[PDB]
Every structure is written in C-alpha cells, then in structure tokens.
C-alpha cells in the first residue's frame with residue numbers, strides 16, 4: 001500500500017559516480033511507472049523484455065533502481081550486449097536483461113564552469129566486468145610487466161579519472177543522469193504493483 | 197567446398213564458431229558462411245593468431261583484446277573494415293603498409309600495447325578516418341607528417357604515452373579536429389604554432405606533462421592557453437585552463453608572462 005520511493009532516486013540532489021554506482025532495493029509498495037513514461041522528462045526510456053505501456057499492470061517481487069552519471073554519448077552503452085569503457089569497466093547489463101534504462105540531461109545540475117570533478121569513471125581494468133558487478137577499488141593499474149607497489153609512475157596509472165563536465169560542452173559531452181530499473185519475480189509474492 | 201580450422205589458432209577458431217553458431221571447430225563451413233561475417237568481437241581472449249581472417253572479406257568491425265597475439269599481418273586484406281579496435285599488450289611492431297588497403301576505415305583504436313615508434317606514412321591511405329586513439333602505449337616520438345593525410349579526423353587521443361616532443365606542424369592538416377588529448381606524457385614543450393590551424397577545436401587535454409616554463413620557450417603555450425581557455429578540458433580536479441602545470445613550480449602554464 002505504501003508509496004515506492006522513486007522520487008528519492010529520480011530527484012536526489014546528488015547522484016553516484018558510474019564506477020561506484022548506487023543500487024536501491026524497492027519492495028512492498030505501489031509505483032506509478034506510467035506517470036514517468038508519459039512525463040516527457042526523459043531523453044532515454046528504453047525497456048527490454050517488457051513493454052513500458054504495461055508496467056502499472058504487473059507486479060514484481062523486487063525492483064532494483066541503479067543510478068549514476070555518465071556522458072551523453074555513453075548512454076548507448078547502458079543496454080544489453082554493448083562494449084566500451086563504461087560497459088566493460090563501470091556498469092554492465094546482462095544479455096537477458098529485463099527492465100528499463102531511463103536517462104535525462106543534467107547539464108544544469110552536474111556541470112560547472114572550469115569543470116565538475118565530483119563524477120568519476122574507471123579507465124583501466126584487467127578484465128571486463130560481469131553483469132551487475134561493482135568495482136570500487138582504487139589500486140594502481142599495471143599496464144606493463146613491472147610491479148607498481150601502490151605508487152604511480154610509467155605504465156603504473158591510477159585507474160579513475162574525473163569527467164570534468166563543463167556547461168559549454170556539446171550534448172554528447174554533457175552529463176546525463178541514468179536510472180536502470182530491474183524487474184525481478186523470484187519465488188515469493190509480488191509486493192511491487194502499479195496503482196490500485 | 198566445406199572446410200573449417202581455416203584458423204589454426206584454437207581460441208580464434210571457437211570465436212569463429214561462436215560467430216557462425218555451430219557445435220564445434222570441426223564443423224565445416226562454406227564460403228557463403230565466411231562471407232556472412234560482418235563483425236568479429238573477441239573480448240578478453242587468449243587468441244595467438246588471426247590466420248584465416250584474410251578470407252572474411254565483408255568484415256566491417258573488429259574488436260579484440262589478447263595478451264598473447266603479436267602478429268597482425270592477416271588484417272591487411274580486410275578492405276571493407278570501418279571499425280578496428282585492438283588491445284594487444286605484446287604488439288611491438290606494425291607490419292609494413294598494413295593499413296594501406298583499409299581505405300574505408302573510420303575509427304582506429306590501438307591501446308595498451310608496446311609500440312615505441314610508428315612507421316612513416318602508416319596512416320596515409322586512411323583518408324576517411326574520423327577517430328584515431330593510441331593511448332597506453334609507449335610512443336616516445338611521432339613521425340613527421342604522420343597525420344597529414346587524415347584530413348577528416350575529428351578525434352585524436354595520444355594520452356598515456358612517453359612522448360617527449362612533437363614534430364613541427366604535425367596537426368596542421370587536421371582542420372576538422374574537435375577533440376585532441378595529449379595528457380599523461382613526457383612533453384616539456386610544444387612547437388610554436390603547433391595548434392594554430394586547428395580551427396574546429398572544441399576540447400583539448402594538456403595536463404600531466406612536465407612543462408618547462410622557462411621564457412621564451414613556454415611563451416606560445418602560455419599565450420595560446422589564455423586565448424583559447426574555453427577549449428581546455430581536464431580529467432583531474434583543477435580549474436581546466438590551469439591544469440597544465442610547470443615542472444618544479446607546480447604553477448599553471450597560463451600564469452607565466454614571457455616578454456615580447
């Protein structure tokens with residue numbers, strides 16, 4: 001009966017960095033996906049394995065809402081079967097994904113003259129991430145044969161950089177906030193339903 | 197004329213198996229099936245040889261990571277390639293003329309390898325290229341006019357190398373360049389006027405280089421950064437125009453006032 005806390009995920013003042021992406025578990029509540037989908041607030045609203053027109057008509061065991069910030073031209077990597085620095089090393093969706101990827105320009109909130117450096121991404125990794133894996137490690141990356149001993153140097157690079165969004169960037173370089181909704185139906189009653 | 201294992205390497209063969217969706221690498225394939233491959237994608241692989249790829253003529257996209265492969269000569273026949281992406285931490289030498297037939301190439305990506313030098317004119321035929329990325333290699337210098345024929349380049353990434361200097365006028369032909377990254381190198385100085393003809397430039401990264409801020413050597417760079425400060429960007433938290441710093445002082449390059 002209680003209201004699902006989607007206003008808290010979508011209207012939070014601060015979002016997570018994509019490498020430290022933030023998951024919120026939604027349970028035992030009523031949610032109105034239709035108001036979001038018809039709102040004309042989003043630049044990306046793509047769903048996989050389910051139609052967005054039928055979300056209020058279904059119930060689920062758990063909904064996961066993962067949120068973060070990336071560049072406009074990286075929203076394409078938040079989709080099943082994609083590759084690139086973001087999908088490979090920062091947020092990876094499974095091939096059999098069931099859910100929706102929602103995104104909106106946040107230049108007005110996440111861009112600053114001279115740069116916004118409170119948003120980071122991971123540039124290097126030994127191997128591609130597995131679906132829904134989170135890696136918040138800050139260990140020097142060994143791009144060569146020599147150990148690094150936890151100290152930066154040649155072929156020994158700190159693995160995280162800041163986006164540095166400037167408000168005069170082109171849209172593909174501007175910040176976008178992203179909400180990924182995962183719809184689960186495990187062996188339990190479904191306690192997340194649309195409005196009555 | 198069915199045949200398979202046209203790819204001696206076992207890891208690569210399974211990769212071709214997975215692409216064609218067959219039980220095993222013993223399964224024969226026709227030429228029609230070989231001509232059906234448009235895209236090969238081999239993440240996190242152990243491929244040691246890409247022999248046999250010379251017969252996939254309609255490949256347009258290739259992306260491959262391997263900590264073992266060091267020969268890439270077979271790829272010179274893929275004349276329909278528009279997207280090539282290679283992460284080979286053992287690639288030390290580029291075969292002579294390898295890209296000279298890949299004239300439809302739009303995006304070329306070579307990262308995490310050991311190339312310390314590039315052959316002369318290696319890119320001269322890729323007159324359609326829009327994007328060139330050569331990060332995390334060991335390049336210590338660039339050849340003269342190595343980019344002169346890429347008149348349609350819009351993005352160039354040379355970060356995370358060992359570049360100590362840049363040739364004269366090396367970017368002069370790149371009149372549509374909008375994004376250029378030189379950060380994380382060993383550059384003490386740039387040639388005078390090295391950026392004067394980049395009339396479409398919108399984003400440039402200059403930080404993490406040991407800039408020598410002695411006058412008059414730093415004059416062109418300090419004056420250029422102040423005139424074009426709207427185009428400077430940074431991946432480290434600093435006021436972006438101030439992100440290029442003098443070795444020793446740690447003062448911003450753009451704060452250095454050199455006489456006349």
Ligand SMILES: *[C@@H]1O[C@H](CO)[C@@H](O)[C@H](O)[C@H]1NC(C)=O
Pocket residue numbers: 006007010011035036039
């Ligand atoms: C808060 O988020 C809701 C979605 O749950 C949205 O419809 C609403 O417009 C937001 N409030 C604002 C933007 O003031």
